[PDB]
Symmetry: D5
Subunit: 155 residues, 10 copies
């Protein structure tokens, strides 16, 4: 399928997609329903980080009232990267960067202990966010990272 | 409780802990047994990212045959940061950084939609790594991030 | 609530809000009057770092004569970050950066001493600037940082 | 008075001071008693960010059992800078950096409105940390920045 | 007085001021003449680094034929910073950066010796450049930095 | 003359010179006295930024009691650079960096207006710091930069 | 198997391995012989980028005459990353960086055209360098990258 | 032949080439047919990294229906560099960067042993991507780097 | 003469000059004839790095058919810097950067040995590139750097 | 021939060779005499940037009275890079960095005009420095860069 070499074309669509989302007062849950795909995937595709299959591109473009160029651009493989500069300053995103700072060594250590030499894939990967109640009062986020284990074996 | 201003004292302890861990053929699962704490927490403390309560610090130092200077240093608040330079190069750790790069915009968007203005905490936070079988043959990692939702409320 | 993925929409609004503020010869204290919120909060929201509740958004848009697009953008959750590049060059802002450079270690030491292992929140946080007279002649600024203590508790 | 051109001599002194503090189980509040100086100043001086007058240098060296070369090194004007790289990774220190990221524009705007063109000094400056109770249960930190206003006037 | 939150408005004004300056074949000496202010101040203000009082702002705007948004923009407190990126590449500007690279240690050492612990202010500051003859034939620049000494006193 | 290829040899010499300076309780004015050279030059040479002529090198080395290596190292051409990282964090040095940030564009403009296309030299350069009294009470520093104008002429 | 959290221990082993290799006048061809593994793998392991299985670890340590702390370190999973700073300066290594700079966009474009959305793995990956004769007189290197195609499929 | 000083003119041409490529649903293999050049070269030229000879430039411009300015721009030598910032974030491109990070030291060591002191050229260089089947199911990419060995010989 | 504070005005002129150069099939050798200046100087001036004498500015703009706003801009002293970011990615430019990396220490050593303490000027400087035949077949570039020696003499 | 993976071994050798050169009061001209190689090559090799053939290594080790470890280390292929950080701060080296900043674009333009698409090699490269008198008094350096033209030819 067709791929994009830079991020500028998908950044403009995301600014157009978000404009329609705010003006029509739509949610990402509403946009992803009837597409057959997960919430995290469809939202990422709208933010220019994934390619939508052709039916989902038409389903989302109908809800937002998007052009036919918008349906074509939503199906293209993007140049991924959502944090300009690599390190964010926005507090909501930074907390996930901070988690990586404290538990980065720990994740590597436990992956090599429980799985072995290799990586936990970010491509053969599924992401899910779930809202749960805190037994001590309040709400909690339970973000799940599901990656296939790729071993590094000697050659 | 006592805090450390630099990371050098805990880096020396971590290099001593790792040397003992290899010579005694110990696992992080074996070091965490009988401490009452989760694997991710105890491992992070050994890697210089957390302070262990005095009972847990004494259990791991006994298994590793460490001095009493090791149990006291294990109980001090460290200067956190496990990734030198913020951005990793090691493939095992980098994959988690890549997850942040693609789904950073997606995580913020869905947190503000499902929770509202605020953050998902990295302090009121739990980490878990679980090994599961992949239906297509092979293994998968199910990393769970459980953080408290802290709202941004007007003042 | 609706969230913004980039800063460009709120940076344009800030230029429009500030242009109206100068043209109406208004102060941030006058714009903050009758909103129920603190001066530091409303000013930050006008500069694109916070979301205003709708009654406060309508009071400021009425004083400045802004359209209904402006009240909607003022209520959206922004992508926070007011210093482009993280490190300021403007002397007024840098002095606050310099305070962090000298007393950064000192703040951590005393936070861990008086409170314990954890953080002083920047989300459960209040800011106040007060003008007081200097006894050697002149005036002084008394900026107050009021943050909730979040402990790091083992898991 | 004598100044140091690099930070290495004072970093070694701080590492010995912290070692003595941990082994004898002393407090920064205990170390600052009988010096006549504030907690924030003496703590910064022990962390290599300020020069102590000789009575304070001798009082702290007696409590920690330091040699005469430590009393002399505590009195020299240091090369200030406590956060290596300018941007911290430790969560406790970062929260103060995050405050600067959100309210940096706000602090400058309100300084120019309440005071005028100029700066709030970091040299004619006092710092204070106070522990207070949160009405929702728990504790809060009340950090105070007290700086002299220096105006920028035409010449 | 009114302050600006970003540098973009003053960068555009500087581009118009410089364009008008070339077309009218005027000097910074001619533009600053009859304003009562020093050459370094008015030139810095025209380059977006200072606020002009309205009598000075109108005399310079009349000479260049600037619009009425420019006279108001010339009177606002800007977001200071004239070297994009902090370190210049242009040889004329770099030479002053290089002077700092070699004599930075010397300036700190001699200020603490001749004045004491503290700084030489950059806000309570006057700048002047004077052309003088070189005894071996040719010209020399005599740049004068006149800053108030602010001491660092214990608190 | 003999040159040094790295900065490590002169960085070690500077630390010994500064330690010796404190133990003899000498000032940079006392060390430069009877050398025939200016205070700023001799101070810079001791701080590893300049080469001393042998008569001056012996006069200063006798006062500090330096080895015979220091006498040769003081006469060798060093690898210049006194601010590690290019941008200082120490407040005393930064104020001079801030002067460069505000008046960098202004200095280039006035150099090209009063002198023409070219630079103000940092090699054919003289530096002097003088203490003067402030009519508003207090003291002031009058730092003078005297550089020869090198024109850029077509080739 | 045991993994390392930092690179410092393997860099010391690598310099000792290289010291022994030069001192004993050994080749990388000889060190990889009798291990059953490819030249590219064993050489990478000696440079701290891979873990050797114990039979290979003893054959290489016997040829260099290394202790038992070396065979244990040679079998540990390292913290990978051979170019300090990410970008090399040595011309031999840089030429490979330049290949990435020119053909980076082309590799992404052709991978998405010939394979589809996804990546070419660097973990399920083999490297080979082969010397072949250049028909224009001279020699050529034929470096082969053999990576598994991992698709990004919707979830 | 004509050279370009910046990448913007070729970046716009690449944006037009890609837009036309999507609308006619053409492949890079289809664009390269009948030009006599390799797939990797022609794709690189369209992505702004190479100059096309006039016959190839016209065959590709006819297929996309481009004007004569596009055929002239396709023949100019560009300012090479396809990864903005040197280090990519897109997963597909980063995998090749990671290959460089792990085997960079290995490539240099083995190049000096098998070839000698010198480089493997990135200019006298050919690139090829080949799709082959993975015996354990799936597909694999076989990217081949063919560079001339240039020795560094004394002068 | 008139100076520019930013590079943006001259970057647009360079883009127009290059477009006219390509459209008229002109060379830098043809543009530099009849100005009396060297090829390297005029070419640099067209690329925004030098100010052209007023007669030369008219001839080059006449040859390219540019308006007079361009020759007026061609006579302005620019903000120099032709490599955005300091380090190039284009291979042709990088090779000259690589020369600096290998022989930078060597140039300083030999300059201080043959000339003495000081610099080789980049302002009192001439550049020439000459095409010569390689005795072993092929062509060679002989770039000549002619800089005045400026001594560092004590003051 | 043996290659080095890091620069530390050659940095130590360079410090001993330079010490011996001063202690024997020798010049780089004297050390290069009787080696058959050019001044720039032998000087670069002593500064850790080139490998000397063993006859040249033995004449230089004999003149400086070095052990056998020096003769072996001078013949090893180093990890090249003489400017730590890529960008120098020492004025003598920076002037050559500044030359590249101004004339970088000009060199690429004239190389593509006089030679064509390709590079001027830094491996098939000669460096020479010659001292000439300035006609109006003073001395000049005439640095000559002699690089082979390597064309980029389509494949
Ligand atoms: Cl992956
Ligand atoms: Cl948090
Ligand atoms: Cl927080
Ligand atoms: Cl201040
Ligand atoms: Cl100041
Ligand atoms: Cl100079
Ligand atoms: Cl992979
Ligand atoms: Cl090459
Ligand atoms: Cl110069
Ligand atoms: Cl080359």
């Amino acid at each position: 399928t067709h791929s994009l070499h830079n991020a500028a074309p998908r950044e403009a669509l995301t600014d157009t997609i978000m404009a329609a989302k705010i003006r029509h007062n739509l949610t990402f849950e509403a946009l992803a329903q009837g597409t057959g795909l997960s919430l995290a995937f469809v939202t990422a595709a709208l933010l220019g980080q994934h390619a939508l299959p052709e039916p989902a591109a038409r389903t989302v473009a109908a809800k937002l009232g998007l052009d036919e160029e918008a349906v074509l651009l939503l199906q293209t493989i993007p140049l991924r990267g959502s944090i300009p500069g690599g390190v964010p300053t926005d507090p909501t995103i930074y907390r996930f960067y901070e988690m990586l700072q404290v538990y980065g060594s720990t994740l590597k250590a436990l992956v090599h202990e429980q799985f072995g030499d290799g990586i936990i894939s970010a491509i053969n990967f599924k992401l899910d966010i779930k809202k749960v109640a805190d037994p001590d009062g309040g709400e909690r986020a339970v973000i799940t990272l599901d990656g296939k284990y790729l071993p590094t074996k000697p050659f």
